[PDB]
Symmetry: C2
Subunit: 406 residues, 2 copies
């Protein structure tokens, strides 16, 4: 068999596309060839997105894989609600429930909540950006009652290159005026470096601060530059390079040629790109299930129309939606598995604490493994310095008679 | 001469559909007219709005009156942002400044904040409906810094 699949890919994602090609190379077989039909236009532009998605559906492809942004998700998924094109993405998961959508990125909100109990704060500052949705802002603010948290939320998103130096001044100066010292950030990874730059430039990384980065791939930036600061910058890892099942992929990826697969040669990979492997794997295993369960995707030569009027489904799409939801496999994010709504379960996430030797696993979390600690590793033992604070008035504490030399 | 115009109306927005026809009856004039082409299909989901847009655009309507929701709004604003066919709405103002969109319903945030200042409030619980857009929940949470409010949402 041969199986055309639509790529509604985001531009600026050469690493994701390289992971797509490496997944295709790994998983392709002459039994059923998952076949590219790929396009790349501005994901923020709902029109151009819809237009290309019509073009791809105008080939009658069996499934489409790609990425969207909150400027588009109730454009795209509304189409999956009508044309029943089965759809897979590891982008940010939606708050609602929709068949024909596979939400390959796990839900960050549960873990990030549980971490707040684990660090035991009644007070934190909270920056966020709009692009993954204000879903985390809502979820934590809804959760404000349960622990009676004080929370301040300041929209960092509208920071732009017109004034991206004095904005961060005024912003962090506001956190000095409230004297905020537990800081949650919810950006995309390719933003976090620009906040961390200003954090270092104005010194706000010494002991007393505590940081979280609300990304599943916390260890992607130049964390080593703030690794010396002394703030406990602590954040998540769905990717774990230590899993030998995964580490064999990490080896193969980092050894694959750097320029034919642009940016694949690094020892580390964005968890978006990593989930591209799991996504292509689930599409392959779903077409394999379809063939093994002996229901054929044998289909009329007519593509259909994304805007027939009234539009009408084609029934085999329901079979693809079953087949995809039936998948359970090992991958770069563990034993991945999906509910009947199209949202993952069993998704297990590690919590990394930036000790100065490097980010190390203080625990892991799942829906049933509620923040299971893994601090049995001894990095940090042998009595790090307890810093003692006090005052100098005679006689209670005084200088040594040789204090200028001591 | 007449100008052909499009219309979309939410199902159940029957008072607005009435007021629209009453407005057409009032402001139609001897020298020029409207030729409304109207749809009353779904609005709470992008598909219906998109199909109606294509139908009425293929009809060549030079302006459209209609409505949207945060679920559908991006679909409209991107379509008009590309195709130069304008859109006018009484729906909530978005965060965006797309051309071709006349977001008539005036800014409510400035007055809200100025009244909060007038009561000199310090600590209160703010509720919200998500689907009007969190632009207010943002613009009141933002100044919970500068105005040191103690909001809960």
């Amino acid at each position: 068999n041969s199986i055309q699949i639509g790529g509604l890919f985001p531009r600026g994602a050469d690493q994701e596309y390289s992971a797509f090609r490496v997944g295709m190379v790994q998983f392709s077989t002459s039994e059923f060839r998952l076949t590219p039909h790929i396009d790349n236009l501005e994901v923020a532009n709902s029109f151009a997105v819809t237009n290309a998605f019509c073009s791809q559906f105008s080939r009658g492809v069996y499934a489409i894989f790609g990425f969207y942004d909150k400027k588009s998700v109730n454009t795209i998924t509304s189409f999956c609600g009508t044309l029943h094109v089965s759809f897979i993405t590891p982008s940010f998961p939606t708050d609602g429930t929709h068949p024909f959508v596979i939400q390959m990125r796990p839900d960050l909100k549960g873990a990030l909540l549980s971490l707040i109990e684990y660090y035991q704060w009644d007070k934190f500052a909270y920056l966020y950006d709009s692009d993954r949705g204000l879903s985390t802002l809502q979820a934590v603010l809804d959760s404000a009652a349960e622990k009676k948290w004080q929370v301040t939320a300041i929209n960092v998103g509208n920071i732009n290159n017109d004034k991206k130096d004095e904005t961060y001044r005024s912003l962090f100066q506001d956190l000095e005026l409230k004297k905020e010292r537990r800081v949650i950030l919810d950006c995309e990874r390719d933003k976090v470096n620009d906040i961390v730059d200003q954090v270092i430039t104005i010194g706000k990384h010494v002991k007393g601060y505590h940081y979280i980065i609300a990304n599943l791939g916390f260890t992607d930036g130049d964390l080593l530059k703030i690794q010396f600061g002394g703030a406990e910058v602590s954040g998540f890892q769905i990717v774990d390079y230590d899993d030998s099942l995964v580490s064999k992929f990490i080896e193969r990826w980092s050894t694959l040629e750097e320029k034919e697969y642009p940016g694949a040669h690094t020892a580390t990979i964005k968890y978006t790109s990593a989930l591209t492997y799991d996504a292509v794997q689930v599409m392959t295993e779903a077409f394999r299930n379809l063939r093994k369960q002996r229901i054929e995707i044998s289909r009329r030569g007519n593509a259909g129309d994304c805007l027939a009027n009234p539009a009408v489904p084609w029934g085999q799409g329901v079979e693809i939606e079953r087949a995809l939801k039936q998948v359970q496999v090992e991958g770069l994010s563990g034993n991945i598995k999906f509910d009947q709504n199209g949202k993952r379960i069993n998704y297990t996430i590690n919590i990394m604490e930036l000790k100065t030797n490097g980010p190390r696993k203080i625990g892991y979390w799942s829906e049933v493994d509620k923040m299971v600690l893994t601090e049995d590793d001894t990095s940090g033992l042998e009595q790090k310095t307890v810093v003692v604070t006090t005052i100098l008035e005679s006689p209670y504490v005084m200088m040594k008679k040789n204090h200028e030399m001591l």
